[model samples]
Target: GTSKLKYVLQDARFFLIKSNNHENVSLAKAKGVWSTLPVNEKKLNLAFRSARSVILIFSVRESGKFQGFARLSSESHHGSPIHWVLMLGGVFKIDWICRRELPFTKSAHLTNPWNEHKPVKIGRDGQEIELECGTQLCLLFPPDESIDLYQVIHKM
Candidate 1:
């Protein structure tokens, strides 16, 4: 069987999720999570379902520093597929995989569709270094710098 690490995500999307619960990131890395959920889905249904690669950055500090990111697994196996972010129970429980962490001061690296911020267009979406408005969750089109790092790590 090919390893999960080998899967190539198509039309990848990025996100920054605000979380005060530090252990949530730990649990996803340590024991795989289906508990934590994204907050808004009004315009996000297809955004979550179609994108094969979903990278998540978490807001771990009220200091407002973004400290973590990783690939959300598309499915358990190649043929045994399920939607990556499924509308289960009430909200979709994104299935994420782990990578090492970094502290990119939120000002330089993230933004949402509506938030006013510095200019640094990325991905296919028109967001800079922030999650979109509406609190706690938003989507972005991340720069290749981030995705490139992820690809390099996968080689090790």
Candidate 2:
């Protein structure tokens, strides 16, 4: 029984460059705290090494209780600081344990290899949620659920 939730990295990557005027300053001067998924720390190493901006969706145990979305950003340079962007919608009550190994490559697209199977399964239970291309996962839960549920939408 895992009390914590998980975050799965999606297809977006963000990068930041210091303006010429800001070159003299340390990257830390304009950085934010990067929240590493406690469960899957290894997966994040590659993400931080290559991507400045990352969009990751979350999940919980099949019998577990919550979900959400988060955007992370950092400098394009190596070892730069990262910032975690918390969304305005949804409530984040779950304690994040760690990162989980993603099923795709470092530069994999949202709909590439993973989409071939279509409606990929996520969570502790066998069929907690199905994921597909053109699907958007964000912080806002649907109207009926009080505890936040990971929201997904497909638009093609």
Candidate 3:
């Protein structure tokens, strides 16, 4: 198992929404309603660097038709950027990967427990994600300076 893993898939049409509207709400709407968003390489790569492999899914929030997917794999520590796993849909399964799997899964120690629920374990609670149609999705590595990993700071 790798030290960490991260996954990010967002709409391509709209980047981060620019509006007087609330940041969180706008982001939610974009993810749920807008299927396409502007790709962010820095953010995408940061997610990939945290894991050995990543499975990204893109689809409409309401209909839930999988528009696309991507599997990511990385090289040695500081060796190279994250690499794609090739033909994602054939190998990736959203249900399975979203489940708990230690380092490969979202970190419970660092993550908020209130966010987890049965049948919906690894999602960011209070933040429902349902990509819309015609959403553009991307998968890649994160930056070298990342906040994904947490250092044990006086654990109980």
Candidate 4:
């Protein structure tokens, strides 16, 4: 069987980027992410070929096995030197996994997709430091580096 983390959506979050550095609006959302499939060379490429930011939210449980929440932050460039941005203010605990393959396009708006679906997790009450976007429980996937977008480039 595949690792529980690989098959069962163990944990995940949604993120949005509000910036005036793109061609379209000032904010975009991305979600249903489970880390760049560690072993896929193609996925690895696509997940590491762009200079953009990503925001992440965390869902955790409490001492009595109750559900709680947490957050972290990260930044992405084109070569895999992502930095984490710390922040907070996520409203839910459930999201939709984007199962569709996105085309490879070099558009800021496409690079920064807005996500409304929420995915939740359980059993996490720890905290870490990198840089906070000024919220108590919202991880910020900052755009200091890039992500691989092989699928996008290949579909052409």
- Using TM-score as the measure, which candidate wins? 1
Alpha-carbon error at 102 in model 2, in Å?
20
Ranking by TM-score: 1, 2, 3, 4
List model 4 lDDT by residue over 73-93, tens digit each: 222212232222222222211
Give me the runs in candidate 3 sitting further than 4 Å from their true place. Answer: 1-41, 65-68, 73-114, 118-156
How much lDDT does candidate 1 score? 0.40
lDDT of each: 0.40, 0.28, 0.26, 0.22
User: What is the Cα-based lDDT of residue 95 in candidate 3?
Assistant: 16
lDDT of 2 by residue, 80-152 (tens): 3333232211111111112222222221333322334433322222111223231322212222233221331
* Candidate scoring better on lDDT of 1 and 2: 1
Error of 3 at 39 (Å): 8.9
Q: Model 1, stretches more than 4 Å misplaced?
A: 1-10, 34-45, 74-98, 106-114, 118-156
TM-score of each predicted structure versus truth: 0.46, 0.31, 0.24, 0.17
- What pairs collide in candidate 2? 14-53, 37-98, 37-99, 38-97, 38-98, 39-97, 39-98, 39-99, 40-98, 40-99
Query: What would the C-alpha RMSD of candidate 1 be, to one decimal place?
Result: 9.8
Better of 1 and 3 by lDDT: 1
Best by lDDT: 1
- The candidates, ranked best first by lDDT, are 1, 2, 3, 4
Candidate 3 lDDT over residue span 1-156, tens digit each: 213322223222211111122332233223322111223333334544553333343332332222333233321122122232111111111111121111212212232223343222233211222232112112112223323222211110
Worst 10 residues of 2 by lDDT: 88-97
